[PDB]
Amino acid sequence: TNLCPFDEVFNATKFASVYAWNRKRISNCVADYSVLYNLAPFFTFKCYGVSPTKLNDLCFTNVYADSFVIRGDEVRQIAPGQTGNIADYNYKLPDDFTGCVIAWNSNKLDSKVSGNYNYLYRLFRKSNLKPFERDISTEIYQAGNKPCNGVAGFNCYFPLRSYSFRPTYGVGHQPYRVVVLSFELLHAPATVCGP
Amino acid sequence: STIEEQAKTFLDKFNHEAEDLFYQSSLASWNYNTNITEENVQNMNNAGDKWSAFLKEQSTLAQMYPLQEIQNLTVKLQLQALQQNGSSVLSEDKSKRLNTILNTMSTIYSTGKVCNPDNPQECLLLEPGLNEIMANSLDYNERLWAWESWRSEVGKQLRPLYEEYVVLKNEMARANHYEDYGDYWRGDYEVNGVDGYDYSRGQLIEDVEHTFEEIKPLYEHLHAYVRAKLMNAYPSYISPIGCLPAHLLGDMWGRFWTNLYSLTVPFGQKPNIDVTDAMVDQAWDAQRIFKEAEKFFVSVGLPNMTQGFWENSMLTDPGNVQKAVCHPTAWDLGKGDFRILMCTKVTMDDFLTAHHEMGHIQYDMAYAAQPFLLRNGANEGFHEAVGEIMSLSAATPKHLKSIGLLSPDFQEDNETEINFLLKQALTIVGTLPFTYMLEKWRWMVFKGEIPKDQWMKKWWEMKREIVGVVEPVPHDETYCDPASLFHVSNDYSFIRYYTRTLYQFQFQEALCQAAKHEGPLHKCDISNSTEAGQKLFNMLRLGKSEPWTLALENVVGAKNMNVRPLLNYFEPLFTWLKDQNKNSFVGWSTDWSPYA
Numbered sequence A: 001t002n003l004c005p006f007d008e009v010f011n012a013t014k015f016a017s018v019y020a021w022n023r024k025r026i027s028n029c030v031a032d033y034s035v036l037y038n039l040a041p042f043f044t045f046k047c048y049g050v051s052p053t054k055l056n057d058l059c060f061t062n063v064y065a066d067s068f069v070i071r072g073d074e075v076r077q078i079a080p081g082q083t084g085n086i087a088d089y090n091y092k093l094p095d096d097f098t099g100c101v102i103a104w105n106s107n108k109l110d111s112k113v114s115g116n117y118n119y120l121y122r123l124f125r126k127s128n129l130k131p132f133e134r135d136i137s138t139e140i141y142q143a144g145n146k147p148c149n150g151v152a153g154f155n156c157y158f159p160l161r162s163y164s165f166r167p168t169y170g171v172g173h174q175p176y177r178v179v180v181l182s183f184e185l186l187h188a189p190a191t192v193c194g195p
Numbered sequence B: 001s002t003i004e005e006q007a008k009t010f011l012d013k014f015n016h017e018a019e020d021l022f023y024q025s026s027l028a029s030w031n032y033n034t035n036i037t038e039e040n041v042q043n044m045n046n047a048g049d050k051w052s053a054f055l056k057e058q059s060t061l062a063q064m065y066p067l068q069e070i071q072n073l074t075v076k077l078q079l080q081a082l083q084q085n086g087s088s089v090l091s092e093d094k095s096k097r098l099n100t101i102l103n104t105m106s107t108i109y110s111t112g113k114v115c116n117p118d119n120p121q122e123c124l125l126l127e128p129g130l131n132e133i134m135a136n137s138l139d140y141n142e143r144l145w146a147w148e149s150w151r152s153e154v155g156k157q158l159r160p161l162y163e164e165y166v167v168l169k170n171e172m173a174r175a176n177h178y179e180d181y182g183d184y185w186r187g188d189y190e191v192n193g194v195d196g197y198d199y200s201r202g203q204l205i206e207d208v209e210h211t212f213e214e215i216k217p218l219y220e221h222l223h224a225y226v227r228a229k230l231m232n233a234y235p236s237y238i239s240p241i242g243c244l245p246a247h248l249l250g251d252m253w254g255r256f257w258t259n260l261y262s263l264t265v266p267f268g269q270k271p272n273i274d275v276t277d278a279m280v281d282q283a284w285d286a287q288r289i290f291k292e293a294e295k296f297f298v299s300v301g302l303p304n305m306t307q308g309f310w311e312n313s314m315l316t317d318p319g320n321v322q323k324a325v326c327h328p329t330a331w332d333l334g335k336g337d338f339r340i341l342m343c344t345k346v347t348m349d350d351f352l353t354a355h356h357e358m359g360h361i362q363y364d365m366a367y368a369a370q371p372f373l374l375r376n377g378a379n380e381g382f383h384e385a386v387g388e389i390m391s392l393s394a395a396t397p398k399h400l401k402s403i404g405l406l407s408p409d410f411q412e413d414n415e416t417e418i419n420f421l422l423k424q425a426l427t428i429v430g431t432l433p434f435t436y437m438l439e440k441w442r443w444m445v446f447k448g449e450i451p452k453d454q455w456m457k458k459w460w461e462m463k464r465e466i467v468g469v470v471e472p473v474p475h476d477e478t479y480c481d482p483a484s485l486f487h488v489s490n491d492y493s494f495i496r497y498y499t500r501t502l503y504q505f506q507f508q509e510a511l512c513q514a515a516k517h518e519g520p521l522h523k524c525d526i527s528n529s530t531e532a533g534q535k536l537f538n539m540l541r542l543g544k545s546e547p548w549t550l551a552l553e554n555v556v557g558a559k560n561m562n563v564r565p566l567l568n569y570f571e572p573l574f575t576w577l578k579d580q581n582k583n584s585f586v587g588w589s590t591d592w593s594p595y596a
């Protein structure tokens, strides 16, 4: 009756930045999906390739828990077939994604009157990200045609930026914590089942 | 990669950088304006400096993308706004002197004081000292003292400084490839590269003067009626055929004729509509006023206020030790932060001011999706015209009756209706000849058509002919009477109050027509009409992304400023005035003066 470590995932003290998103393997445990709803009306719980009501009577393999922080308007990009700065450059879900995307407003934790500059995101890149690809490079993005020579200059930008979370921000710019579960359904010896 | 793609990426970095940095300045400015300490002035100024320094750095960087090689018009708009050299095209030596005069004249206007004859210990500033006399005193000589003393002890201080101001501003304007500083100011209305919607800087003068010709019949009859009433009050000082003395116009300059309603009210037995008592009757409060204003905009399809508006706005005077700037302002800090700063009392005046300032918020919310540099009104007159049309609909007896502040069985008669329009014309119509004439004088001075040794002669020649106003005391060229007004000595464009006045009535007519309003224009209330709100929204969301001619077309169905809607609004007053002046002189003689 090893209860799956969802307490570690959802109730962690600090989340990762979206560009350097975290990934946690979940195996050989009982995945009770009935006690995520213990959040202040956690705004989003959307599953693809599966139905949320059946979730706690199935059996999966290759379970991964991804987690990061974005702003409210960027939550709509955590879904198959979406584009935008987050989907293109930070975290991309495949077209045939099978899993669940869980997100909730975290203004009371990740905001600051003077501004929260803990969380980052990538603004420029040579090309889009492949699904589930992670890039934490701080290499200087070249927007011109002369070499940037690894120095921030004209047509030479640092690829990352900060989210600058303040609680007086609107909902669209307020911080949202996101958890993206990825599983393979009904496969092989079935490491993770739950009720 | 092309130079156009490089500019898109550059503006991408700028858009993100600017939104964070502008927010700090907006927040620091907000903290001062809500909590007046010395610590907050430092925090406000420091943030304002960081923001100003940031724009200067990005102005230089943007200039390394020549406009002649960009085809996407939206990118050209953002780059042109950021590439504005401004007064940095001068030398660092002449630039320092211009600021020395702008900051000096600002000090003179704000801190210039005048003391009475036989009382030096006591002295009066402009606010509240002299403005109190020019707005409330009904004595000829006391008004004349304040009018002349302000223009001969403070106005003369500004006269040498304005001359240097004209030379440097023109040099700055010509270095940025404008004909003169007046041509530079008219650049707000310029549009290039869009077939059918273009607009030249010179065309503004043609449009303003062509429209002002059609205002002359209404203003002449309003001027004739006001003079006849004022002649009854001041029998020995006012001619029935001459211009009105400049010190008897309700304020320091005659910019508005509002404070002449007490002497010119047609029907003083029929009371005005003041629901202030009824709001007190039902124990309304500041939240209720803004909650009622919120319902009004929702009634036409526009969204409700964000929850951050209710949490972060200051809608009441904090009183006690916490001092705050009580001028009603609508704040757009960015990143979804929308606020209103207002020391709201429970009065019909503040009730309409809430609908006005909240209309600014709806405009701010509408173009929030635009890039940073395009978040503003179509031109300088758009934003305030959107605010004014809200207090037009919210003050009608139709709207007041519908919300239970006015008794349902209330009968409107043409006497109270004429009283209201006369009050409206004293403010809205009275300023138009004053506004056009003032900017015309500034336009000609910057063009060089008026030499220094004839500045004040041409100023009062134009006051007599255009405005129908005559100086009570002859002024030589030691004076500078235009500089005696804030907008002149503090270096602001003034034609906006003409264009916005015409814009707001084009908006109201088009919206009231969409709302199927039957009857005279001034009684219209666009409430409960989602069709009118949609037509308004189709312009508000544009922001600056499109030429203002296109933005105006999305509301009124025409591509240019039109004065017929303004005349339509005052038609019941116009026909009443013409019958009222049938035994009076209409027009004025320019060579009559009160000083013989």
Ligand SMILES: *[C@@H]1O[C@H](CO)[C@@H](O)[C@H](O)[C@H]1NC(C)=O
Pocket (backbone or CB within 6 Å): A006, A007, A010, A011, A035, A036, A038
């Ligand atoms: C997080 O903590 C709350 C109580 O603070 C609890 O109700 C909830 O179940 C926890 N979340 C998970 C995933 O265990």
Ligand SMILES: *[C@@H]1O[C@H](CO)[C@@H](O)[C@H](O)[C@H]1NC(C)=O
Pocket (backbone or CB within 6 Å): B035, B037, B038, B039, B040, B322
């Ligand atoms: C106003 O600012 C001072 C610091 O300058 C601070 O001590 C005070 O608490 C502020 N007042 C309010 C109401 O926040």
Ligand SMILES: *[C@@H]1O[C@H](CO)[C@@H](O)[C@H](O)[C@H]1NC(C)=O
Pocket (backbone or CB within 6 Å): B008, B072, B073, B074, B075
């Ligand atoms: C201009 O650029 C924007 C964004 O780069 C694009 O959405 C728009 O379609 C472009 N317009 C034209 C006319 O190319």
Ligand SMILES: *[C@@H]1O[C@H](CO)[C@@H](O)[C@H](O)[C@H]1NC(C)=O
Pocket (backbone or CB within 6 Å): B304, B305, B306, B307
């Ligand atoms: C605005 O209206 C929407 C529904 O149209 C509602 O969900 C929301 O809570 C409202 N917000 C406020 C602040 O009233």
Ligand SMILES: *[C@@H]1O[C@H](CO)[C@@H](O)[C@H](O)[C@H]1NC(C)=O
Pocket (backbone or CB within 6 Å): B398, B399, B402, B403, B525, B527, B528
């Ligand atoms: C708008 O509709 C409501 C619905 O009851 C009504 O009470 C209100 O009087 C209407 N307002 C106008 C101006 O017709």
Ligand SMILES: *[C@@H]1O[C@H](CO)[C@@H](O)[C@H](O)[C@H]1NC(C)=O
Pocket (backbone or CB within 6 Å): B414, B415, B418, B576
């Ligand atoms: C009001 O209207 C009637 C129309 O028959 C007219 O006789 C009366 O003189 C009008 N009064 C005013 C003050 O307009």
Ligand SMILES: [Zn+2]
Pocket (backbone or CB within 6 Å): B356, B357, B360, B384, B387
């Ligand atoms: Zn306003």
